[PDB]
Design a protein around this ligand. Structure first.
Ligand SMILES: [K+]
Ligand SMILES: [K+]
Ligand SMILES: [K+]
Ligand SMILES: [K+]
Lengths: 292, 292, 292, 292
């Protein structure tokens, strides 16, 4: 499922930094119960950066086993070398995931033609649906609407998570792609605006701690009831901002711990424990949302 | 050494995308003859992003073998995960390299405290000298002078490659570190300016194809002969700019092939072959520098 | 009238640089006939910068005389000194204009508190409605939503022309102001998006040459018929971009001359005549819009 | 001269907002005693934006009278309209000023060809030496090195105040102009660096309150004594930063009052009185420099 509120799920860890199965089960049950549309497993918010390939596959497989067919799972699968991206994607074929979230090559700053070849080749070598992920603040490269237009013609490239926060991209892309191509916000603070402009949903950090309100907001937006969705969005707006007061997923993991959703807020270096000042800003945002 | 003209050497490839030993030997001999001070092996310009860790080590080991003690070799060794950077660096202990060029975590955008802990931990698990590498346009992370100052206190963190192109950083860092911390430019176009402000050399892309000019420029600079140095700079300025006309190392590999320094200009996806327009551009720059 | 398609009208000049009454009459008749909502006289596109105070008042008065009650007129009235802004605004009280478009102080980069005091004082000293004008690319200062919220409480401050092109500002502002506060786009390329997000109209450059299509687009947008408005917007999008291929109003004046709407395309230094390359880009945009 | 430490002098005011002759005399005597090289009268820091053209001329004439030939006086003379800049400059012909600091048109964002024609026309209608002034953060216009090169050929365009803080510009301009074109910094924080790269002095805000230190810094710099110069720079660096804690000249006028150099810190709207927090900040900077 590729519409509505999709959670960019944390990968909960014990005090040693290893994946905590009990905490993950608690999160998945929460998402099933709260009407979340799907789970992105080992995306950015899932510390894709710091898990080894074994861990990355283990977390996705554990998420699928725990979900037990109750909610669809999308795996985070990008890489900055095209042969690697292909390789890692093969490993998930027939896993039970419904799709892959594949980021633009980071660090090596490819041309638009390079991006076209990269993603075309990934898609050629799988039957899985691919969702392109554009996040220039992290990767140093910006997948432009024209190139998204070229890629949307590839049968298996089915949508984009547009994380620039630049709302002009919504209708620049829409006009170049077919009506079944999915446009998903990757910027919680601008996501309601994104849907009002014609976007189809959000791949959300805030959804980790406010799943029901996120799922209701996105349904109201889909129905056209923007004034009603905006009431919910105004209560969540402090979280949408303050979950990035320190690098993601530091604040959201601390919030999940405070709510009792995970056992510990531990992350892997170079992510650091939340500062005291951060804890206070996040807890005030949680109170604004009505969660504490 | 860690001073003068240090080449960010290309990883020359065959048509299959694997390292070409004959071409690498030819380059290394060229650098020895040209007066280059050191070689950074499998840094950014050497396609660190698209070699796997074994391929990367094979290139470094081959480069050391071929250098045969005639020219010092520094290995590119970043990772965006701290545990992984430590293992990946450990592999070169007792290899023969003289130090490591370690990049700031890319994509995950750690805090300055996070950067401090990452580099401190790397430095504690090795005896090799570490040169920090700041290139926010690629990494989405900017290692600020205050943090460099804190890290320069760690015994084996010995210098920085400052690739922002922001010349104010030279004296901001110089005032916070001891007189033997090395400051190197990572931006060819501003490197002579960077040395004029107090920097000690440059880790250069342009040096791949103008090694003698780059070494003579840097010697003059170190001797305080800036007007003289600048005449050489003006001759090379179109190269300093146009070797980034398309994403590095696309232009510089073509240039190396056009000069007879390597057998093929092949790169790995998502890097693409140079366009016709890019060729003409780089060819005019080579003509300007007197190399063609 | 402060809703719909409002034209940022050129000030047509003869070959000597003096205002051309016959050309101005032709434009005003065209706007009356084409369903434009109102005319902004001597705004940015009207070369407010280069007219002396005598000329500025003369053009507004001539525009009012020629309009003859058929279309409302808004005068451009900003200044970067608060006493001056007050002074110039007094001169239009009882003129027959319906309102003033008052820009944020340019060059001196005031604080948000400074902006608050500036605009509060202007509004205090007139009965005329004031429309705030935010255009940081021109002024060096950015009137933020919080400050717009404070100013919207002043009885006479009735709306804003938001020219950043940053579409997140629409609902940031809306939520802080009352439902009768008018939100007007000042960025033709993003103006339809702006209205879809809840904006009320556009103060438009494109409207100078495509008045009817602009007026129909804005009415469809007001009715909620965004798919229909977007068809028109897609035909106008080359003009929305290419009217800024050289500094405004250079391209739009050349376009008005090409259509026969004004006698000459003359501007005042430091605005320069359109280049040949500019003429060709603009004429292709006009053909795309169906106007040539 | 047009070299060494040149003060961008405040226009001290009474509580009514008009020039305070007693305070201006005291400042001018202070500069003569301190070794300042020249005074820029009614530039940016002198509130050029909020004086009318007569008030501006009165200040310049009073400054010359009070200077009594002891220290050269340059007048701020920009306009964003070419015809107006020419008239406004003509007024100072035979006044006694030694030259004019003429700003790039603000707000109307002319092309480089437009900037060339504007400055060329100004220079042709006067015999006074013109110093170009590039400050895109205030003007929205960036006068590029290539254009400076073209303008430096005009006999009485004699130098540039480069207030971008972009240190690469020093050598880009120096390579295109003759050895007697003057390059001055307009950014206190980077001015010593700018001189280290080949610049000839600074038009300084900090010099209002640390005139002796600034003059000694600039002498040392001109003599090649950069380490010595830098010790003075480090003492003044918090001032160089915090005199812009709130919009210039809000901090520097408060500082002048706190030092007993002027009678009141009054400014004209939209400049606002300094906040309590800003006072404490600037006071700590003054303490650091040893001036309080
Ligand atoms: K498709
Ligand atoms: K050290
Ligand atoms: K109001
Ligand atoms: K000259």
């Amino acid at each position: 499922m590729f519409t509505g509120s999709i959670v960019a799920i944390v990968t909960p860890m014990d005090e040693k930094g290893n994946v905590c199965r009990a905490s993950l089960k608690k999160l998945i049950d929460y998402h099933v119960a709260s009407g979340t549309s799907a789970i992105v497993s080992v995306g950015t918010t899932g510390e894709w950066a710091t898990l080894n390939h074994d861990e990355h596959a283990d977390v996705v497989m554990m998420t699928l086993d725990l979900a037990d067919g109750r909610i669809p799972v999308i795996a985070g699968t990008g890489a900055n070398a095209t042969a690697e991206a292909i390789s890692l994607t093969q490993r998930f074929n027939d896993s039970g995931i419904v799709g892959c979230l594949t980021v633009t090559p980071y660090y090596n700053r490819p041309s638009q033609e390079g991006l076209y070849q990269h993603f075309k080749a990934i898609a050629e070598h799988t039957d899985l649906p691919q969702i392109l992920y554009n996040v220039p603040s992290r990767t140093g490269c910006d997948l432009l609407p024209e190139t998204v237009g070229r890629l949307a013609k590839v049968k298996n490239i089915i949508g984009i998570k547009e994380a620039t926060g630049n709302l002009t991209r919504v209708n620049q892309i829409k006009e170049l792609v077919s009506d079944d191509f999915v446009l998903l916000s990757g910027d919680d603070a601008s996501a309601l605006d994104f849907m009002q402009l014609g976007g189809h949903g959000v791949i959300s950090v805030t959804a980790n701690v406010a799943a029901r309100d996120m799922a209701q907001m996105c349904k109201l937006a889909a129905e056209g009831h923007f004034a009603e969705a905006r009431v919910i969005n105004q209560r969540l707006m402090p979280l949408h901002n303050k979950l990035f007061v320190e690098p993601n997923p530091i604040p959201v993991k601390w919030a999940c711990k405070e709510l009792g959703l995970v056992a510990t807020d531990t992350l892997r270096l170079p992510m650091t424990p939340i500062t005291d000042s951060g804890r206070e800003t996040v807890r005030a945002a949680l109170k604004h949302a009505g969660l504490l």
